[PDB]
Design a protein around this ligand. Structure first.
Ligand SMILES: [Mg+2]
Ligand SMILES: [Mg+2]
Ligand SMILES: [Mg+2]
Ligand SMILES: [Mg+2]
Ligand SMILES: [Mg+2]
Ligand SMILES: [Mg+2]
Ligand SMILES: [Mg+2]
Ligand SMILES: [Mg+2]
Ligand SMILES: [Mg+2]
Ligand SMILES: [Mg+2]
Ligand SMILES: [Mg+2]
Ligand SMILES: [Mg+2]
Ligand SMILES: [Mg+2]
Ligand SMILES: [Mg+2]
Ligand SMILES: [Mg+2]
Ligand SMILES: [Mg+2]
Ligand SMILES: [Mg+2]
Ligand SMILES: [Mg+2]
Ligand SMILES: [Mg+2]
Ligand SMILES: [Mg+2]
Ligand SMILES: [Mg+2]
Ligand SMILES: [Mg+2]
Ligand SMILES: [Mg+2]
Ligand SMILES: [Mg+2]
Ligand SMILES: [Mg+2]
Ligand SMILES: [Mg+2]
Ligand SMILES: [Mg+2]
Ligand SMILES: [Mg+2]
Ligand SMILES: [Mg+2]
Ligand SMILES: [Mg+2]
Ligand SMILES: [Mg+2]
Ligand SMILES: [Mg+2]
Ligand SMILES: [Mg+2]
Ligand SMILES: [Mg+2]
Ligand SMILES: [Mg+2]
Ligand SMILES: [Mg+2]
Ligand SMILES: [Mg+2]
Ligand SMILES: [Mg+2]
Ligand SMILES: [Mg+2]
Ligand SMILES: [Zn+2]
Lengths: 99, 144, 142, 56, 118, 159
RNA sequence: UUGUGGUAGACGAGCGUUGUAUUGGAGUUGAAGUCAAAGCGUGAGCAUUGGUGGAUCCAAUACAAGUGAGAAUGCCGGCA
RNA sequence: UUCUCGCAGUCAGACAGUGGGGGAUAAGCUUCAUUGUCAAGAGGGGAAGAGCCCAGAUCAUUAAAUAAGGUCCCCAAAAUA
RNA sequence: GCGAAACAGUACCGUGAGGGAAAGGUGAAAAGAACCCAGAGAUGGGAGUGAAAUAGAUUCUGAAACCAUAUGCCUACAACGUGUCAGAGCACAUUAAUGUGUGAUGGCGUGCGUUUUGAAGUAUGAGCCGGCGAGUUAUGAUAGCAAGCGUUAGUUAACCA
């Protein structure tokens, strides 16, 4: 019903039919990815990581986050630098929890 | 990106409490009163929704000050005029107005804020065993 | 359905005319005339003339009933100014700005007229968005 | 003395908030019906039941 | 060849003006004040991204610590028990468990409490 | 510039004690009267130098790529005077040769008059002598009709 | 793999304006201008649609510059 | 960090520790030698601080372990003897 | 761009020598709004002409500062370089995008240029908006890069066509 997964470096608590956003995984939309690192599943929690506990997820989209403008400015020092960032993400929904 | 945490949308589980300051130290009572009033001890703490319970203090004149603080430590209040600095000793405060002393002590343990006004409002302090606050059916807890 | 009347380069200043104009917004026809006929202000005998002309061309030109008209909006926009030199002391000089106001009064019969104005605004915003959608369908077609 | 800082367009309107006007009290003449401001002779010079001045 | 400035100054100025939309009065009207506010707002956003990372950590520590005092155990020892039991879970997810699934959170505390380390 | 523009060489305001800033003339660059600081001048050269042998090499390669290519046909004296001076026949000639849109350039050694009478109302086509064509006229052509004796003079010029 | 704070300063790579030369293209079935919108870029910047507007403008490669405005108790005009 | 060539900017410095001169073992004084920082450098500690301590900011992450410093409340975090 | 696109060395300033501006665009065609209504009238609202009258003599396009009106949100126990990160509630629906408008409340937060060892500065410069406003040209020298021609090399200046 719920699991503690480790995608990228963050840990997500996921239920059945739950869509959460993670960092780009380099996978086409529509595939069936298998998240490996699982900490807690149901009631049996493994100490390092649970073994054979697999999280079946489907990738929904590969969009980008909102634009972030980084404007570094040193007051009265003739330094005005500007930069923009659009971090890519991927949205995926849980399908089935492998025993 | 990640999953956002759950935050209460101005949800009020606030309840009424009763405490007896028969022989409690001023600072030791005030620290727990502020924690109880702010709701910091609550499992779910959203620090913009004043999710903290009311609290009533009984027997304010019965509190104690350790050491010689009853005659050597002074409480100060200055009006906006010149010379309007009124000083009262610990002993005079413990007799004449003891409720104000506990009130100021509890208020001092709160962050400078616009929510701290409501937080200090939820403290009903009485100098006697009687209180007009029995209509709320407040539960009883010890040393708090 | 707005009937209106205008007056360009009115000698009264907009500052001293808006003060009287706020005394007439939302009032009924007969009540509006009565208040403005007995107010001791200079900008009272000019809005009265404008108001009467607006009533006349509402019940004659546009064909309105005449017992349901209320002052929808009466405002005094800023008109063109005139610059003069006032001679000061010790050889200096300052600039006098003769201010003029563009007066316009508008009355309606329907008490829900703000809604229709929002509807045309909504239609214009709405009209902008389908064209974007129509452009998207054509773009995908190619 | 003169303002060392310019007053914005918001403080200006706050001060003018008390410059609003009041509607003078009006009444109806008892012989011709036109509205006249209270306690004053109408345009016909007929105040109450006494003919004061000749008609306009 | 008299090059004349037009549509160049206004476009780059209106970009700054568009960014400073929703400010107080002249701070959104005039280009100069708008430019200063955007630069200052960018500095605040930059500094507060770092500070957000620390402040939300503090809230997770606070919620978990409070949740612990109701059961008689303290924060300083809970993390110590987690390391000896090799269990690796964020304070974020641990706090999320204590607010949404109290029963399962009690399971984690029960195992770390007494069970043999490793 | 600031000195040539008609204006007062006096100081408009006093140097000090006036609330206005210090000014020295009414025809300064930052004034509306207008004194252009540097500005374009009619003494500019705009000219460049290229070595004589470099120009021959440039001309050599341009002839090499344009010759031995499509639209590089050979022409003789008969049709340079068969035009009769009427541009209608030459329009028909370009239509028959399918060179209507091409910027055909006639390279001529004897300056025929009948050919020059025509091709003058045509803004597209043009005719030049061998000592008059350059690199740009050669590579703007996209097509050219070269006379046989012009070609013999071409080899002679290259040496 | 080693790196990427930065003023004076050195070096390298680019954007944008107007015009000219070669190519192609759009335009009273609506160009430039101009306003608005919940777009795209690492940055100068670049698009899409709609309103207004009534006749020129765009893309590529090169060339030539009166080529980039927030400050000078700067000049002029307007308005607080 | 040596040699050759092109283009510079800099010639008003400040404070802290250490060894001295002038001053009175006074100065946030002045003049030197040396180690650092600021100048041209944000972050954390010092309640607030250019120069003290911990360190060196490519951007995003509501991930984890730590340095100086700290764990009654403000304000994150402790208990025993 | 000549100071001067208009009747400009005019208006205007000064006893005088002298100094010295600003100001262009209706429409293809005046077809320049007869007539009606209100008003003392200008004028405005209709009518009419016109493709267009929100092209009407105020006459191409019409930016910002500035002044008013209004849908929606918030605001009268509140210490504020006015923003930022979180964040309810309210109201809508888009260049369909983990959407947009406002922001009860919490954490953090002393502008921009200049010149200084050091400026939030009780140092300085700017009231705001728009336009204009400061590394050029001619003739030579050195150095970097690149091309042409080369070991009795390389290259022309004036002038002529
Ligand atoms: Mg005099
Ligand atoms: Mg206002
Ligand atoms: Mg007043
Ligand atoms: Mg400019
Ligand atoms: Mg000039
Ligand atoms: Mg760098
Ligand atoms: Mg171009
Ligand atoms: Mg357009
Ligand atoms: Mg320039
Ligand atoms: Mg020294
Ligand atoms: Mg010295
Ligand atoms: Mg020393
Ligand atoms: Mg010494
Ligand atoms: Mg000494
Ligand atoms: Mg010193
Ligand atoms: Mg310096
Ligand atoms: Mg620092
Ligand atoms: Mg500090
Ligand atoms: Mg670094
Ligand atoms: Mg430590
Ligand atoms: Mg704490
Ligand atoms: Mg005279
Ligand atoms: Mg009209
Ligand atoms: Mg006008
Ligand atoms: Mg116009
Ligand atoms: Mg209130
Ligand atoms: Mg109060
Ligand atoms: Mg304070
Ligand atoms: Mg605050
Ligand atoms: Mg805030
Ligand atoms: Mg502050
Ligand atoms: Mg600058
Ligand atoms: Mg100085
Ligand atoms: Mg100050
Ligand atoms: Mg001074
Ligand atoms: Mg100075
Ligand atoms: Mg000033
Ligand atoms: Mg300016
Ligand atoms: Mg050279
Ligand atoms: Zn009467």
């Amino acid at each position: 019903m719920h699991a503690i997964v480790v995608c990228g470096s963050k840990q997500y608590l996921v239920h059945e039919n739950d869509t959460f956003f993670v960092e780009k995984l380099e996978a086409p939309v529509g595939k069936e990815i298998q998240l490996d690192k699982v900490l807690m599943l149901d009631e049996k929690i493994g100490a390092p990581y649970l073994e054979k506990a697999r999280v079946v997820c489907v990738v929904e989209k590969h969009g980008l986050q909102r634009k972030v403008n980084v404007i570094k400015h040193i007051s009265q020092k003739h330094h005005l630098k500007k930069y923009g960032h659009r971090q890519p993400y991927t949205k995926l929904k849980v399908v089935r929890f492998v025993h | 990106k990640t999953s956002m945490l759950t935050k209460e949308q101005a949800n009020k589980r606030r309840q009424w409490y009763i405490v007896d300051a028969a022989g409690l130290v001023l600072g030791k009572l005030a620290v727990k009163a502020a924690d109880l009033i702010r709701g910091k001890n609550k499992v779910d703490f959203t620090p913009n929704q004043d999710c903290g319970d009311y609290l009533i203090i009984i027997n304010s004149d019965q509190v104690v000050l350790t050491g010689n603080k009853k005659e050597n430590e002074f409480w100060y209040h200055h009006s906006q005029y010149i010379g309007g600095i009124k000083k009262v000793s610990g002993r005079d405060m413990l007799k004449k107005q003891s409720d104000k002393l506990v009130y100021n002590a509890v208020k001092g343990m709160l962050p400078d804020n616009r929510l701290s006004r409501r937080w200090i409002t939820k403290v009903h302090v009485f100098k006697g065993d009687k209180h007009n606050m029995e209509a709320q059916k407040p539960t009883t807890l010890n040393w708090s | 359905m707005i009937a209106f009347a205008k007056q360009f380069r009115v000698r009264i200043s907009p500052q001293k005319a808006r003060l009287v104009c706020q005394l007439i917004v939302g009032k009924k026809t007969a009540d509006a005339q009565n208040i403005l006929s007995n107010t001791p202000k200079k900008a009272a005998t000019l809005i009265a003339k404008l108001l009467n002309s607006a009533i006349a061309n509402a019940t004659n030109n546009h064909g309105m009933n005449g017992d349901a008209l209320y002052v929808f909006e009466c405002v005094a926009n800023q008109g063109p100014s005139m610059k003069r030199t006032i001679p000061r002391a010790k050889g200096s000089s300052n600039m006098i700005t003769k201010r003029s106001s563009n007066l316009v009064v508008k009355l309606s019969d329907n008490p829900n007229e703000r809604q229709e104005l929002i509807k045309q605004q909504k239609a214009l915003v709405k009209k902008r968005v389908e064209g974007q959608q129509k452009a998207k369908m054509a773009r995908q077609k190619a | 003395a003169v303002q060392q800082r310019r007053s914005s367009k918001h403080r200006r309107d706050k001060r003018r908030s008390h410059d609003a006007l009041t509607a003078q009290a009006l009444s109806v003449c008892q012989k011709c019906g036109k509205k006249k401001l209270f306690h004053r002779v109408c345009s016909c010079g007929m105040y109450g039941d006494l003919r004061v001045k000749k008609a306009y | 060849m008299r090059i004349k400035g037009g549509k160049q100054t206004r476009v780059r100025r209106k970009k700054w003006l568009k960014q400073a939309s929703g400010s107080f009065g002249t701070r959104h009207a005039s280009y100069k004040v708008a430019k200063q506010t955007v630069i200052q707002a960018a500095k605040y956003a930059y500094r507060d991204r770092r500070n957000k990372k620390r402040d939300f950590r503090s809230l997770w520590i606070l919620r978990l610590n409070a949740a612990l005092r109701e059961q008689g155990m303290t924060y300083s020892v809970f993390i110590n028990l987690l390391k000896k039991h090799n269990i690796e879970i964020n304070r974020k997810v641990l706090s999320e468990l204590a607010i949404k699934e109290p029963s399962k959170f009690n399971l984690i505390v029960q195992k770390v409490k007494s069970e043999q380390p490793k | 510039t600031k000195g040539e523009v008609r204006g007062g060489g006096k100081k408009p305001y006093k140097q000090k004690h006036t609330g206005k800033a210090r000014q020295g003339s009414t025809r300064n660059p930052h004034f509306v009267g207008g004194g252009i600081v540097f500005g374009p001048k009619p003494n500019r050269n705009y000219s460049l130098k290229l070595n004589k042998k470099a120009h021959t090499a440039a001309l050599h390669t341009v002839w090499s790529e344009k010759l031995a290519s499509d639209n590089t046909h050979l022409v003789d004296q008969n049709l340079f005077n068969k035009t009769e001076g009427k541009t209608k026949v030459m329009m028909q000639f370009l239509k028959s040769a399918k060179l209507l849109d091409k910027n055909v350039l006639f390279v001529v050694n004897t300056l025929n008059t009948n050919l020059e009478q025509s091709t003058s109302n045509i803004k597209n086509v043009q005719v030049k002598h061998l000592d008059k064509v350059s690199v740009r006229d050669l590579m703007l052509a996209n097509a050219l009709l070269v006379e046989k004796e012009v070609l013999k003079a071409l080899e002679g010029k290259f040496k």
